[PDB]
Amino acid sequence: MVYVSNKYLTMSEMKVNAQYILNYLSSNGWTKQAICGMLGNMQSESTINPGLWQNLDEGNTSLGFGLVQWTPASNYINWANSQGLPYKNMDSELKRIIWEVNNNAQWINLRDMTFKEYIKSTKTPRELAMIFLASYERPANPNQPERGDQAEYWYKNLS
Numbered sequence: 471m472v473y474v475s476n477k478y479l480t481m482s483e484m485k486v487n488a489q490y491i492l493n494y495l496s497s498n499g500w501t502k503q504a505i506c507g508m509l510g511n512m513q514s515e516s517t518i519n520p521g522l523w524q525n526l527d528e529g530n531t532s533l534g535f536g537l538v539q540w541t542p543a544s545n546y547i548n549w550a551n552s553q554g555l556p557y558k559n560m561d562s563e564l565k566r567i568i569w570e571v572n573n574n575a576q577w578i579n580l581r582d583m584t585f586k587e588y589i590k591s592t593k594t595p596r597e598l599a600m601i602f603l604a605s606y607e608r609p610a611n612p613n614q615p616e617r618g619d620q621a622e623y624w625y626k627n628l629s
């Protein structure tokens with residue numbers, strides 16, 4: 471059970487999705503700290519909603535889409551379409567992230583940590599949140615300390 475929509479999720483809804491992501495990536499070798507660092511980012515990007523378009527502007531593929539706001543959305547949608555996966559789908563977006571780790575896509579090493587180091591890291595969820603912000607997301611505004619607060623919140627509130 472997951473929420474997939476072009477709407478901002480409440481805290482209760484985000485928790486359902488966040489637990490799902492933790493369970494999924496745990497089977498693929500990621501630490502809870504690394505996953506929660508990423509979840510703290512996903513909360514700011516999309517309220518952890520795989521269905522969400524930047525500005526709620528549905529169908530604008532030049533702008534952000536999905537958990538991590540792939541921008542342009544076509545960076546992800548083209549991939550899903552080419553891979554025969556449904557683009558508006560929780561697992562399809564988790565598969566993209568796994569593809570990125572495996573193929574060294576998206577990540578730029580600005581903090582002396584590679585994407586492969588990241589997913590195995592037991593640094594704090596706050597620290598990993600900030601590394602993921604800087605290395606993977608890279609939004610126009612870099613000053614979003616709330617992402618580390620959110621990372622720590624998920625680490626404490628999920629199993």
Ligand SMILES: CC(=O)N[C@@H]1[C@@H](O)[C@H](O[C@@H]2O[C@H](CO)[C@@H](O[C@@H]3O[C@H](CO)[C@@H](O)[C@H](O)[C@H]3NC(C)=O)[C@H](O)[C@H]2NC(C)=O)[C@@H](CO)O[C@H]1O
Pocket residue numbers: 515524534538539540541542545606607608609610611
């Ligand atoms: C209005 C706003 O801030 N939009 C946010 C997006 O900027 C952000 O997506 C990220 O945008 C940056 C900058 O365009 C992307 O980084 C660039 O990536 C290309 C790789 O093709 C590389 O050539 C550039 O060097 C690099 N620039 C910088 C400054 O690092 C980055 O890939 C985008 N991130 C993602 C996940 O696709 C998204 C996500 O934070 O949020 C929008 O609101």
